[PDB]
Amino acid sequence: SDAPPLTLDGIKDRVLYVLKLYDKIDPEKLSVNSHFMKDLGLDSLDQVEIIMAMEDEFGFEIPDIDAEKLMCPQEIVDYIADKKDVYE
Amino acid sequence: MLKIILPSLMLLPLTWLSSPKKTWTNVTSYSFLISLTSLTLLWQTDENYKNFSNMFSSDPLSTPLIILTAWLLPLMLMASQNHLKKDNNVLQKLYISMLISLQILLIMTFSATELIMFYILFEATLIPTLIIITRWGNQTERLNAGIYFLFYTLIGSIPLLIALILIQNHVGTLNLMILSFTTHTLDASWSNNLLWLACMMAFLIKMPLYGVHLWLPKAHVEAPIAGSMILAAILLKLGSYGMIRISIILDPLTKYMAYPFILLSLWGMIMTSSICLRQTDLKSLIAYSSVSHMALVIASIMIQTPWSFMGATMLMIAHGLTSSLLFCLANSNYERIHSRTMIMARGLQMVFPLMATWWLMASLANLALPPSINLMGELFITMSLFSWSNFTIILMGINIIITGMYSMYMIITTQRGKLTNHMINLQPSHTRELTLMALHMIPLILLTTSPKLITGLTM
Amino acid sequence: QWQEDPEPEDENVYAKNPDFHGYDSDPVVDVWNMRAVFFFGFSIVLVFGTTFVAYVPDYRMQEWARREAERLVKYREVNGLPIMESNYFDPSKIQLPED
Amino acid sequence: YKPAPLATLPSTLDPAEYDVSPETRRAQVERLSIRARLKREYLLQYNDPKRVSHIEDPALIRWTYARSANIYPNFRPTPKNSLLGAVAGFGPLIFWYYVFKTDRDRKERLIQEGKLDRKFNISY
Amino acid sequence: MNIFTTSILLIFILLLSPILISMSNLIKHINFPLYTTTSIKFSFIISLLPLLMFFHNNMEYMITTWHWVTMNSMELKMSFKTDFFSILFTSVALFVTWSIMQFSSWYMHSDPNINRFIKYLTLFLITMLILTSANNMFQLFIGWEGVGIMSFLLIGWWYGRTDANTAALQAILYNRIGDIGFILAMVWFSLNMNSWELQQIMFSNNNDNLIPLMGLLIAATGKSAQFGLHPWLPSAMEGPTPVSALLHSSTMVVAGIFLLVRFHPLTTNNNFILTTMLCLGALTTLFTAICALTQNDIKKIIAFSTSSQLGLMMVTLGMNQPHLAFLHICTHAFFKAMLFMCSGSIIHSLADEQDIRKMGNITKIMPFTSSCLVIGSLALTGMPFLTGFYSKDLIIEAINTCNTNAWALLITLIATSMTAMYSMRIIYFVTMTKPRFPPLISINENDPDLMNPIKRLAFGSIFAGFVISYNIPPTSIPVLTMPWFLKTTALIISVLGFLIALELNNLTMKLSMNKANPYSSFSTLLGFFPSIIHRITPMKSLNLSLKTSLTLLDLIWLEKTIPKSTSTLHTNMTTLTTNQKGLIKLYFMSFLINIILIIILYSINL
Amino acid sequence: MTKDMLPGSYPRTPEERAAAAKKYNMRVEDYEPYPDDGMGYGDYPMLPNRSQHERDPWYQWDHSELRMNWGEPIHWDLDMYIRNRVDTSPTPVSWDVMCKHLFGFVAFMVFMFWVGHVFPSYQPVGPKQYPYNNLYLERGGDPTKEPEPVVH
Amino acid sequence: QLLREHWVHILVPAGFVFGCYLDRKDDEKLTAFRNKSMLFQRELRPNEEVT
Amino acid sequence: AFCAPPAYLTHQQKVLRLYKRALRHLESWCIHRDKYRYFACLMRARFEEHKNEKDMMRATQLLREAEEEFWQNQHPQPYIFPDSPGGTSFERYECYKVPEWCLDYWHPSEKAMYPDYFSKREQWKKLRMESWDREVKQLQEETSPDGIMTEALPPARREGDLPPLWWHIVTRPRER
Amino acid sequence: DSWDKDVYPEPPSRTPAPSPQTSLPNPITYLTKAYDLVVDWPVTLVREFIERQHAKNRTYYYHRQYRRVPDITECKEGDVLCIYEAEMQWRRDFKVDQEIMNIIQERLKACQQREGENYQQNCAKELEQFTKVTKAYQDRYLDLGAYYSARKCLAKQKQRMLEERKAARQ
Amino acid sequence: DARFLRLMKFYLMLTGIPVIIGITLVNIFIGEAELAEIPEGYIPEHWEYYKHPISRWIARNFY
């Protein structure tokens, strides 16, 4: 009855929202096209820590082989959206 | 019982005497009208049976069948229109002028006063059948059914013949409603024991057992649909009109002698019903389900009790419709997909949202459903058996459980699930076929209301 | 190669006569046949056939049963007889063998 | 833990999946090429225009034909099969033969006294 | 003799109106749920008048309405029975169902087909009242299996999710077993009493009616899923939550257990099945309760909770105190059909999330449901006057007072402590335990299509048992003597089941990793009953159908014995027929043999 | 369909095995047919007994709902091993012990009832005392025969 | 008129008539025990026949 | 969903995957959230310790018995979301997602409604039929003569061209 | 309905004799008195109007009496004529021997329903009437198959009498 | 599916309404004859034994 659909902006303004709570990276100087391993100083293990918040933010647990690929936070906005069929 | 046949003769020229684009229409319309003329014989105000002629006759047992056959004809004549959409006008006529003969010959049998006229039409039903399955089959294996369907039906027929010969030598006339009266008590001799075989056996080929029933799947798998309806509807469950009539002369021995054929059913009645879980060929699936039910009817006649016969007549006719129905339900998909496969089109009800409600009303009638007749037949057959033996239920219950699986399982793997997205060739529905399932059920819905009609000799 | 014509691929006949009922390709044979299917069969044979699903009285002499039965008790039960006496064919007019 | 044929074990156990050796590794590559060439055909044929009918699915057919009309030629008469079919065919057929018979023939000796009082029964 | 008959039929005419108008080219014009739900409102209004007639006079009519068939000293007539059993349940199973459609418009909108949905409930809602109202044992049987069939079709509703198709079919598997021992019975009575209807059937008070009566247990265990057939119900929570409310707590689980109370004067005169009422019925009060603790999906937890309550009804039949049961049949609906009714309000507000781990402050975010859920679960166990006393009291008074058994009391009493110990769980992890649920707040509430029905079950769950306690004719003579620690048992014991569950679910707060003992893993899943059976029977009782019955017997043996052994017999004798070189130096030496034979033939006869 | 695209009979002559797995579109080593002992299992594979649940439920297949692609040939008994009938899904508890606690529960469960049936939890009182002898008239009797002797 | 592209419709009901006659020629062929049956054996008013 | 899982080509993702599932089998033990948040950082160290070892034997012979213990520690009923495999609503909304080819059987009186949505449809399907032979030709001339073939996952080259196989993923039905 | 259906004095009806304090209106008679003017009063007028049109075009029917038409013991073997009459005379009584059993059934249930929990010693009169019937029924028609013809019943009645005069010999 | 039911529902009404309306009118006006006893020898006319009007009309024209 409720649960209004997103507009890829309540995602993008909400994904980056999440990443700023992590406190080990992202000192309010990241961006939307900011890769993880090469220009933020993460491990691969530090990446699984990221996707779980997004998983815990929507409830559609990402498969094994899609967190392997999602590094940029745009790519996270870019996969959430292709699935949930946004931009009507 | 003459005003029926003689019009049905006049249909046979009508097809050869009609124009091409007017022929299914005329012949279809009157065949319905033949049903009404094939219904006047319901005026059974008394137990005094309607012995019209010195050869033709009637009963409460036949009058369902006689009605039924004239009702299957428009139906079966209709369901094979898109099938053979392309063919000569000749075949498009001959397939009518051959198929009708089943109506005319069976009427003569089911009305018959005798056993010869039953006999010499018990096998004259064969010419219009074998001609079909061998001709309009769609498979390389069409022919072996025309061999199996042919010979088993005959290899038993000939002892059956010889016994009718013998009975005449002792008595003279070999007819009904006389042998019933001038009946002698048998000596239970070995020579007289073989007679009980020969007079039961061929009918037990029709009603298939756990044994000889290999002709029944090979037949239905390969018939287009009209070699499947009648072969399921009134060509099968024809033995009963034979097996009830002939059983009357020789009751004082068929107590002790009939335990095998009874018992060979009540195993196969469970096995065929349990085979009918783990199968692939849909068009085979139904063929066993008929063998499952009719195995109960063989467990009916050999007990001679009224509710047992009633348990058959409420079951034969209750099965012929729903059987002839379910082939159409499959024929609502084989003509679209062209494969007898229970898995290829599984996630329907997105595309045929209504036809599902003809599967669903049917499969329920396939199993024992309370406000129905496939139960009332399957119920009374249980009741008589509980009298015959209080442990048949240990065998019956194993079926009605299983019957609650495959009948519904046909719904699951054919109307529930993710659709096979890769079948563009799903024409939603021909109004041709879609009204078949009406012309099966609305009989049941009405016939279920007042089944005072459908009962046998006894009620 | 053996030189038979190839398979005829699917036809997809809901392109002309999207009102195609199932009977023949040409538009005006479906309509004037189905109306024959319904009326000759589906209307009258059910309706006028079901007119006998209620009519055709005393089907095998059951309605007549109650009358004679209700009669047979009120004559037999009032006077002193026991209903359902013991049997058919009284021991008179039946000659059993000896010993 | 103890695996069984039913309720088999996970794949993280069962020490395949670990031996990345060029004799074990090549398998998981070549199946996968064998697999991709094939699915790519279905992809190349699913969304092909002019595909108007369904798709054949021959392997599905090879399973039915293998199961229905390709059994009897593959028969060999053996024990474990001739002994097994009789005990599946005639066994239960002969088990009950004593049951229903003795059910009756014990029912019959009682009826010929009255020790098994016929209550209000009419079904025959 | 006029008003009473004229209404009890008329409710069906109300219920046949939604369906008989469902195909008129009219449903697509109007609000068919409200139409239906409006009819349901008048049906209850009409239904009270019979109930208002019975309490005043206790009249128990036996309407027929129809003659179906004549059959050899059995006039098969439809006919309706009504005596304290199809006069109250007929209204309360109807009343609650008013509180389902209103819900089922709110829950399950954004659905292209409710009109098709709502159709099927009234198909069901008719069939259950038949089962209830049916005089015959066959008219009943219509309401036996049509009830079952129609649940297969709402459990399996989203006709993907074959897991839901299974758990629908799983029920039908066990329901068509409950079919059997029913049909054992309805066969036996005919074959000993040519009636099929209850009235004459009662006259077999003295026949040692042992096995038919045991068949009813099979019928009981199918619909009223005890233990040999328990697991279909919780698995059949994959369907929509109102259906789980309507069917599987108030209008199907009653069926099997309702059957026996209509046969209550025959379970009286036997002392063996009168036990296995208890020893089987009470098993479920214990087992499913233990199972119910360490589950997480609510709709399962409520489902399990029926199965114990389901048994405790049978435990009434564990003695000859049946009328208490029917009183517990009623009250069991004004609770369970609140919680689902209350749980979908919890769920559909937020996402389809329906396990408790992911929510913990329903008190504050929803002060409404967290007020009425408690009206359910508090009143459920033993709250001293909220209809789970006027039910539960008179139960526990008897169980510890009749000469029944020893272990049955314990497992009940231990389990009667245990209706708390999972209600405490639900009413703590959901309603307390500072929240945990994803951030988006989409809670829609105050919708008068939601409160107004939730209100009434609360009004019902509080008042009705009292209202029914006195207004009914008192039978089942109540032993009330009960020294200090018998009459006071259900009260303290439910309080006891709070405190432990409080400390147990309070010690999960402290930082400590707990050990995976078999306890709370045996009971976490099911007691392993599905996990182990649902992969041997369909691997044995299904693999005992291919290689012994199709690809052994029907196909590769039987196709040899008669046909191919015969064809081969002839074609082998056929080659030796006509495989001679066409000479005459051979044929004549072959003829001359015949010449000698017919000599040597004739020269013996003489 | 082709004759030598459909199955055969127990491929002896190990050169032939290539004409089975490449027929069925399969890796040769992985293809070992049935032991041939008796039944008409011909040149069909074995394909270890995976229920179709352990298959990674993500990854859209060519045949949805069924966990197979357009080929990757079929387990013989793919009627039971679909996600409609059976699940051999690896269970957090082991079969021999899992099959033990259940039957170990019940066999202990039943034994208490018999233990309890010995010592029923009765209430220390007498039985009822009915109005008349044992009423002989509504319980069901014959009030033209004798009266009955019993009385309080 | 034209070449009678539809006349077969007359064809079948001529059979139902002809059958009802042949069904009746059967009747006057038997025509015995017209009243000699023990059951009815009713002498009529002054008029002539029964069946 | 949108990729293919190949052979798990190395120890890394095998562990990230193990960490993924194993993590999820802790919250069902740690119902409360504060309780949960603690044990993860400890188990975090259980990997961050012995981070880099390079002993492939011991890497496996730690990673192998890592489940010989975890299996006897995991939770039987884990927390899987709605829409997740095995979970509620994994397939609920699949009884409606019709495959969009069937749309091309509606006749007028059903598509006489809205002459625009089909005015779109024809200019979509014009793109499809007019982009096929160019599309397939790429797959033909794609350098896949022998050997490795994962899926080849090919894009559109920078042209006035449309990518490879796209009717599958695009034009698929929505969700809800 | 005739006076053969044991319609024992139809009301032993009680009486309305309230005794509540500050007495209330009873919804039964506060509503059934609102019922016999609103749906009974129409429907009573309609059938009151249906009746008067029936007596305009009144039509009669009758019962079709039948005869003795001698039974089988007078009847000859082989002679199909005689036996056929007697045979369809017996199946013509096989109903009336059996529609009776429908009436007792019909009468054996309504008794205890108009007696409730009395149920016995007030339905023994009807129950003794039932065993009396069923005993002759089984002694008439029990062992028979479904090909029941009077030659079988006649033999059933004739096997039995032998024991009736074999057990009177010791 | 909708076209169909619209036709199924119609062509049955095409003869169901002439009947059901017609059969309500016969019973309203007339029908449901009564018992009677023979006038000491009358030779009833073969449909003086059946109740329902149309049923004792069919029996006149036929049978």
UniProtKB/Swiss-Prot annotation, chain A:
GO terms for cellular component: iron-sulfur cluster assembly complex; mitochondrial [2Fe-2S] assembly complex; mitochondrial inner membrane; mitochondrion; nucleoplasm; respiratory chain complex I. The modification O-(pantetheine 4'-phosphoryl)serine is found at S44. It comes from the Eukaryota. The modification N6-acetyllysine is found at K20. GO terms for biological process: [2Fe-2S] cluster assembly; aerobic respiration; fatty acid biosynthetic process; iron-sulfur cluster assembly; proton motive force-driven mitochondrial ATP synthesis. Disulfide bonds: none annotated. It is found in: Mitochondrion. Phosphopantetheinylation at Ser-44 is essential for interactions with LYR motif-containing proteins. GO terms for molecular function: mitochondrial large ribosomal subunit binding; structural molecule activity. Residues 9-84 form the Carrier domain. Keywords: Acetylation, Electron transport, Fatty acid biosynthesis, Fatty acid metabolism, Lipid biosynthesis, Lipid metabolism, Mitochondrion, Phosphopantetheine, Phosphoprotein, Respiratory chain, Transit peptide, Transport. Belongs to the acyl carrier protein (ACP) family. This is Acyl carrier protein, mitochondrial. It comes from Mus musculus (Mouse). The chain holds residues 69 to 156 of 156 of the full protein.
From Swiss-Prot, chain B:
GO terms for molecular function: NADH dehydrogenase (ubiquinone) activity. It is a multi-pass membrane protein. InterPro entries: NADH4_N, NADH_Q_OxRdtase_chainM/4, NADH_UbQ_OxRdtase, ND/Mrp_TM. GO terms for biological process: aerobic respiration; cerebellum development; in utero embryonic development; mitochondrial electron transport, NADH to ubiquinone; mitochondrial respiratory chain complex I assembly; proton motive force-driven mitochondrial ATP synthesis; response to ethanol; response to hypoxia. Keywords: Electron transport, Membrane, Mitochondrion, Mitochondrion inner membrane, NAD, Respiratory chain, Translocase, Transmembrane, Transmembrane helix, Transport, Ubiquinone. It holds the Pfam family Oxidored_q5_N. It is found in: Mitochondrion inner membrane. One of its GO terms (cellular component) is mitochondrion. The chain crosses the membrane at residues 23-43, 60-80, 90-110, 113-133, 147-167, 194-214, 224-244, 257-277, 284-303, 308-330, 350-370, 392-412, 434-454. It catalyses: a ubiquinone + NADH + 5 H(+)(in) = a ubiquinol + NAD(+) + 4 H(+)(out). It is an enzyme of class 7 (translocase). Its EC number is 7.1.1.2. Belongs to the complex I subunit 4 family. PANTHER family: NADH-UBIQUINONE OXIDOREDUCTASE CHAIN 4. Core subunit of respiratory chain NADH dehydrogenase (Complex I) which is composed of 45 different subunits. NCBIfam families: NDH_I_M (TIGR01972). This is NADH-ubiquinone oxidoreductase chain 4. It comes from Mus musculus. The gene is Mtnd4.
UniProtKB/Swiss-Prot annotation, chain G:
The keyword GTP-binding does not apply. InterPro entries: NDUB1 (IPR012575). It holds the Pfam family NADH_oxidored. The keyword Membrane applies. Its main location: mitochondrion. It is found in: Mitochondrion inner membrane. One of its GO terms (cellular component) is respiratory chain complex I. The chain crosses the membrane at residues 6-22. It comes from the Eukaryota. It is a single-pass membrane protein. Keywords: Electron transport, Membrane, Mitochondrion, Mitochondrion inner membrane, Respiratory chain, Transmembrane, Transmembrane helix, Transport. GO terms for biological process: aerobic respiration; proton motive force-driven mitochondrial ATP synthesis. Complex I is composed of 45 different subunits. Accessory subunit of the mitochondrial membrane respiratory chain NADH dehydrogenase (Complex I) that is believed not to be involved in catalysis. Complex I functions in the transfer of electrons from NADH to the respiratory chain. The immediate electron acceptor for the enzyme is believed to be ubiquinone. Belongs to the complex I NDUFB1 subunit family. This is NADH dehydrogenase [ubiquinone] 1 beta subcomplex subunit 1. It comes from Mus musculus (Mouse).
Swiss-Prot record, chain J:
GO terms for cellular component: mitochondrial inner membrane; mitochondrion; nucleoplasm; respiratory chain complex I. The keyword Secreted does not apply. The keyword rRNA-binding does not apply. The chain crosses the membrane at residues 10-30. Signal peptide: none annotated. Keywords: Electron transport, Membrane, Mitochondrion, Mitochondrion inner membrane, Respiratory chain, Transit peptide, Transmembrane, Transmembrane helix, Transport. GO terms for biological process: aerobic respiration; proton motive force-driven mitochondrial ATP synthesis. It is found in: Mitochondrion inner membrane. Complex I is composed of 45 different subunits. Accessory subunit of the mitochondrial membrane respiratory chain NADH dehydrogenase (Complex I), that is believed not to be involved in catalysis. Complex I functions in the transfer of electrons from NADH to the respiratory chain. The immediate electron acceptor for the enzyme is believed to be ubiquinone. This is NADH dehydrogenase [ubiquinone] 1 beta subcomplex subunit 5, mitochondrial. The gene is Ndufb5.
